[PDB]
Amino acid sequence: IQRTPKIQVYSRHPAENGKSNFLNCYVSGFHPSDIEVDLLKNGERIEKVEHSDLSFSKDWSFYLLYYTEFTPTEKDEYACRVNHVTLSQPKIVKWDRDM
Amino acid sequence: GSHSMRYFYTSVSRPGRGEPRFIAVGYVDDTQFVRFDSDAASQRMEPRAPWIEQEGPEYWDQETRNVKAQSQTDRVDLGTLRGYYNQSEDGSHTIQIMYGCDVGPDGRFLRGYRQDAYDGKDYIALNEDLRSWTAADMAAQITKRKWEAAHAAEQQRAYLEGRCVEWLRRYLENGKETLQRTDPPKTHMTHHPISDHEATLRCWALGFYPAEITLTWQRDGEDQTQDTELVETRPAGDGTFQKWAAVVVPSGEEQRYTCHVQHEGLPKPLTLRW
Amino acid sequence: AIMPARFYPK
Numbered sequence: 001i002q003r004t005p006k007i008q009v010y011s012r013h014p015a016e017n018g019k020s021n022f023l024n025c026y027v028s029g030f031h032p033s034d035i036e037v038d039l040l041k042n043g044e045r046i047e048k049v050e051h052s053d054l055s056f057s058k059d060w061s062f063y064l065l066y067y068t069e070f071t072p073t074e075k076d077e078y079a080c081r082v083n084h085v086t087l088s089q090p091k092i093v094k095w096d097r098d099m
Numbered sequence: 100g101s102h103s104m105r106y107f108y109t110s111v112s113r114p115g116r117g118e119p120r121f122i123a124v125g126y127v128d129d130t131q132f133v134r135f136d137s138d139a140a141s142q143r144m145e146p147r148a149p150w151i152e153q154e155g156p157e158y159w160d161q162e163t164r165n166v167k168a169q170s171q172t173d174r175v176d177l178g179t180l181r182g183y184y185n186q187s188e189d190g191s192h193t194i195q196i197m198y199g200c201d202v203g204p205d206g207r208f209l210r211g212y213r214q215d216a217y218d219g220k221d222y223i224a225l226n227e228d229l230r231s232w233t234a235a236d237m238a239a240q241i242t243k244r245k246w247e248a249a250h251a252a253e254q255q256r257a258y259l260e261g262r263c264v265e266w267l268r269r270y271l272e273n274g275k276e277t278l279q280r281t282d283p284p285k286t287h288m289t290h291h292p293i294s295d296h297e298a299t300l301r302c303w304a305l306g307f308y309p310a311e312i313t314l315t316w317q318r319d320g321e322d323q324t325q326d327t328e329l330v331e332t333r334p335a336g337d338g339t340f341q342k343w344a345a346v347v348v349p350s351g352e353e354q355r356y357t358c359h360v361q362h363e364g365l366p367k368p369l370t371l372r373w
Numbered sequence: 374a375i376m377p378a379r380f381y382p383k
Contacts, residue, residue, distance in 0.1 A: 001219040012335045014305075026333045031219040032193055033109060052334075053134045053147070054122045055107050060195055060216045062109075067336050098291065098301070099330075099343075106375055125375070161374070168378040176383040198376065223383075242383040251381040258376050266374040 003061050004086040005030035007093045009079065015072045015097040023070045023095065025080035028063035036083040037066045040092070042076060072097070100204030102128055102278070104267040105212075108196040110173035112181075114189055119177060121170040126199075127270050127278055129309045130338065135166045142167075150274030180217050183238035192218055198255075200263035206271075211259030229256040282308040282339060283364030288371050293347065300373055301345040302358035306335070313361040314344035323356075 006029045012022035027037055033054055039046040052065040070078065078095035105126045110119045118137065123144075125133040132148035139145075144162035146152045173194050181192060198213040214224035221235040223242050230252055234243040246252070271278050284304035291299040302314055310332050316323045329344040348356055353373040360369040 003219065006331070008330060008333050010333065010341070012337060022336055024334075024336055028331070032191070033111060034191075053124045053131065053136070054109055055124050055126075055131075056109065056195060056197075060219045060221075065334050065336060098289070123375075158374075165375045165378045168380075169375070172380055172382075179383050245383070246381055249381050254379060254381075255376075262374060262377075 001031060002086050003029055003031040005035065005082055005084050005091070007080060007082055007091065009093045009095045010099065011072070011095075011097065012067070017073055018071065020069065020071050022067050023078055025066040025082075025093075026063070027066070027080075027082060028057070029061045030063075030084055030086070031061050032085065033062045034085070035062075035064070036090075037064065038081040039066060039068050040079040040081055041070075043079075045081075046070075100279075101201065101209065102267060102271060103199060103201045104263055104270070105197060105199035108169060108173065108194075110170065110177060110194045112177045112192050114191065119170070119174055121173060123166050123169070127267065127274070129340070130274075130278060132270065132274075133162065135163075135170075137170055148274065148277075150277070151270070153273065180222075180238065183241060184217075194222075195219075198259070200259050200267060202264055202267060206264075206268050208260050208264045211256065211263070213255050213259070225252060225255055229259060277338070280308070281362075281364035282306060284312060284342075284360055284362050284369075286358075286360055286369055286371055288358065288373050290353070290373055292350070296350050297347055298350050298353070299345050299347055300353060300356055300358075301343050302360075302371055304342045304360060304362075306339045306341075307362055307364060308339050309363065310334075310340045311363065312340070312342055313359075314342055315359045315361075316344060316346045317357045317359060319355050320357075 005027045008026045010024050025037055039049050046068050049066055049068045056062045079092050081090050081092045083090045108123045110121045112119045121137040123135040124131055132151045133144055134147050135144050144166050177194055195216040200211050201209040203209050211229050215222045223239045224233045232243045234240045284307035287303050289301045316327055326347040332340050332342045335341055358371040
């Protein structure tokens with residue numbers, strides 16, 4: 001069976017401009033486990049990005065947390081870009097600090 | 100005060116070249132404490148929690164031997180299942196295994212689990228009595244007959260009621276400062292106009308542990324699900340979790356709405372109001 | 374600690 005990823009993009013801590021924080025992209029509910037996840041800064045891939053060890057839920061779908069240290073600003077835009085066999089094109093989800 | 104230990108194994112064949120990619124992770128409740136990845140450099144079971152680092156070389160040697168054996172088992176079983184399903188050697192397939200034990204506040208065995216998947220669907224699972232198996236299809240029925248004749252369930256049962264419980268108890272003691280702590284949610288509400296006449300109220304829960312939580316809205320004291328939205332509980336990345344729930348309300352009527360928060364860390368549910 | 378190494382082929 002194949003299952004499409006769900007994506008949430010959010011910060012570890014309450015976001016405040018000028019204060020160091022972590023940007024998270026939580027990808028879940030997908031199958032199979034091969035997946036591509038990038039964090040973007042103003043559309044450009046961030047090089048320092050780590051992720052959690054692959055695990056899965058009761059229904060056997062996988063989840064991963066991808067994350068990077070960042071300092072939010074008023075002007076800089078952040079996003080997560082996911083590709084997976086179930087997606088026609090990469091899926092991009094913008095970071096919204098209200099969410 | 101109840102607790103669980105679980106291991107999760109994922110094996111993915113790669114016909115284009117080499118052995119399957121194998122990843123094993125161990126958890127106590129919502130805290131990861133060990134990992135093995137066949138593609139990492141150590142070729143060892145590795146610590147992922149500070150409190151397991153005190154175990155001695157003998158511990159790591161035993162865990163490494165057993166987890167490497169399991170990777171080879173999964174390799175073999177990937178080939179057998181490909182044949183049961185009459186599949187080509189060309190494609191990638193996945194075996195997943197979860198097992199582990201639950202204990203009560205008293206430290207004693209409550210429940211055991213062992214279940215297996217193939218390509219993301221149920222394959223075979225040990226039933227709650229730890230004496231019988233559920234096989235999803237005619238492929239898994241083959242496995243079931245072999246495992247019954249080998250008396251696999253007895254051996255599984257002995258581990259789940261035995262060493263699983265005993266090591267979970269040891270880890271809860273050695274890691275008690277974090278593992279036996281509950282962190283209740285840090286809660287607050289935000290307010291977001293949608294128009295001159297409507298606004299979003301968002302009830303936030305941050306920094307809690309364990310992950311299980313319930314956020315509910317009421318209007319004038321009665322549950323409300325219409326016009327609500329919620330996100331799935333998500334990891335903060337620092338061993339805590341986050342969640343929010345929101346409701347759209349007529350501007351001016353905010354005080355009719357309450358967010359109710361249930362968490363193991365809270366002796367009484369919390370109520371928030373704008 | 375993980376289950377003992379004992380092979381029950383599928």
